[PDB]
Amino acid sequence: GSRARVYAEVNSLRSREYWDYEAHVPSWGNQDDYQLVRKLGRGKYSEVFEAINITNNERVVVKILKPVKKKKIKREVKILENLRGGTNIIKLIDTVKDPVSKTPALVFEYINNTDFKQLYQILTDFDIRFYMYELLKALDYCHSKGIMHRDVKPHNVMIDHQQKKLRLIDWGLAEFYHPAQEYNVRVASRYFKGPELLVDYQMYDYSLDMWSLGCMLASMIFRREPFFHGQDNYDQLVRIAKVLGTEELYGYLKKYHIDLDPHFNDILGQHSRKRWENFIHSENRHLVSPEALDLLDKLLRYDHQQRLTAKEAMEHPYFYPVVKEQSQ
Numbered sequence: 395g396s397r398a399r400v401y402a403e404v405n406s407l408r409s410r411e412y413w414d415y416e417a418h419v420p421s422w423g424n425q426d427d428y429q430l431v432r433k434l435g436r437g438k439y440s441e442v443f444e445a446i447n448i449t450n451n452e453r454v455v456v457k458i459l460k461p462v463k464k465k466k467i468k469r470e471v472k473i474l475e476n477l478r479g480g481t482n483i484i485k486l487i488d489t490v491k492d493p494v495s496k497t498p499a500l501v502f503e504y505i506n507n508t509d510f511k512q513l514y515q516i517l518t519d520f521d522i523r524f525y526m527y528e529l530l531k532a533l534d535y536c537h538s539k540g541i542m543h544r545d546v547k548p549h550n551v552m553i554d555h556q557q558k559k560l561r562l563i564d565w566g567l568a569e570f571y572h573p574a575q576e577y578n579v580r581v582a583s584r585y586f587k588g589p590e591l592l593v594d595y596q597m598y599d600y601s602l603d604m605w606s607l608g609c610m611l612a613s614m615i616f617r618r619e620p621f622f623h624g625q626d627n628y629d630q631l632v633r634i635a636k637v638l639g640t641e642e643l644y645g646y647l648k649k650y651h652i653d654l655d656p657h658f659n660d661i662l663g664q665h666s667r668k669r670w671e672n673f674i675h676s677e678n679r680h681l682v683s684p685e686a687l688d689l690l691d692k693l694l695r696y697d698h699q700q701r702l703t704a705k706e707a708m709e710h711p712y713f714y715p716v717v718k719e720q721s722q
């Protein structure tokens with residue numbers, strides 16, 4: 395079972411209405427109470443706008459949802475409601491519909507974000523420890539609430555580097571955890587997909603998010619973004635195996651009785667495990683410490699039951715400087 399023993403059965407300990415999102419009935423307000431100002435982004439499921447609430451002059455973001463199964467809308471809404479007030483989780487302010495088309499939309503707080511491609515080039519050692527610790531709070535919180543995010547990546551982490559604010563965004567792929575449930579493996583961005591997804595192992599858990607977090611930590615301390623840069627889902631596993639090793643992959647597959655797609659026979663090759671110190675050079679040495687490497691080593695592991703939980707990662711010595719400052 396899940397390494398996060400205290401969080402494994404939580405949803406079974408709550409009321410059915412907590413997780414039964416098919417049965418959830420949202421309360422929809424009127425999008426006419428918001429004035430759209432500028433488009434921020436677009437993707438396959440939504441587009442997002444900066445807006446002003448006309449009744450109180452607050453700046454907000456409006457995410458207008460593209461047509462999908464009503465079930466996926468109910469899921470994202472119920473998850474955000476269950477996460478109300480959670481540490482470093484993007485705040486849902488409202489759930490509205492357009493007054494003529496009835497198209498649903500979600501209203502969030504606005505973050506004065508710095509795009510990660512710019513930000514990651516200027517971060518200090520302390521800054522990386524701080525932002526990673528603040529992201530871990532959000533993952534410990536949502537996992538404690540029985541929810542896997544399933545799309546952790548830099549674009550989904552809003553960072554105001556002037557006010558030192560961080561929010562985890564885009565809960566549209568998130569899902570409730572239940573032991574032994576088979577999940578859809580078509581989640582996460584390619585570069586952040588855990589090995590479990592790449593080998594079609596459906597009985598995954600919260601530890602998927604901890605792989606994606608480790609990929610982020612590696613890209614920050616080593617200044618190589620994304621860290622594992624596959625050309626497609628097959629090549630993604632090859633890129634992982636060139637670092638973690640092929641013999642180590644086969645031991646993982648054997649433990650969980652995982653069958654490997656035969657196409658991998660043509661492309662995996664044979665690769666020794668690399669030492670993490672091999673990634674250090676003059677441009678990143680100031681961001682790497684023994685504590686960083688020990689933490690990373692305990693995140694980027696094939697075996698999803700051996701990866702640290704979010705709380706165990708927060709307890710790691712790498713974050714001692716941040717804990718000291720937050721209590722001083």
Ligand SMILES: O=C(O)C[C@H](NC(=O)[C@H](CC(=O)O)NC(=O)[C@H](CC(=O)O)NC(=O)CCCCCCCCCCCN(CC(=O)O)C(=O)CCC(=O)Nc1ncc(-c2ccc(C(=O)O)cc2)s1)C(=O)O
Nearest residue numbers: 433434435436442455484502503504505507509563564565
């Ligand atoms: O379309 C067509 O015609 C077809 C065709 N298509 C294609 O070929 C392919 C696919 C194919 O092959 O088919 N497609 C593409 O190439 C598409 C093009 C498209 O189609 O549009 N590429 C994109 O769209 C990329 C769009 C990215 C945004 C562009 C940036 C401009 C806006 C400024 C943002 C500035 N920045 C940095 C950053 O954002 O980096 C900020 O931070 C501002 C502050 C901010 O945001 N603060 C926030 N606070 C809270 C937020 C929040 C809260 C919650 C949630 C949530 O919970 O969700 C979300 C957000 S946000 C074609 O295009 O011809």
Ligand SMILES: O=C(O)C[C@H](NC(=O)[C@H](CC(=O)O)NC(=O)[C@H](CC(=O)O)NC(=O)CCCCCCCCCCCN(CC(=O)O)C(=O)CCC(=O)Nc1ncc(-c2ccc(C(=O)O)cc2)s1)C(=O)O
Nearest residue numbers: 403405406407413414567569570571572575576577578579
């Ligand atoms: O030890 C023992 O002896 C007993 C023991 N119990 C207990 O101790 C306690 C006792 C107690 O506390 O009172 N009870 C429990 O713990 C029970 C469980 C149990 O008891 O069992 N807990 C619960 O109920 C809590 C359940 C929480 C669920 C949270 C919501 C999870 C939703 C996941 C969706 C995943 N997603 C979406 C995605 O991933 O995006 C997928 O896509 C999945 C793939 C998929 O959809 N696949 C299929 N779709 C349709 C199929 C199908 C449908 C119909 C038909 C047909 O019509 O023919 C045919 C096929 S197949 C025990 O556990 O044994």
Ligand SMILES: [Cl-]
Nearest residue numbers: 398537703704
């Ligand atoms: Cl966890």
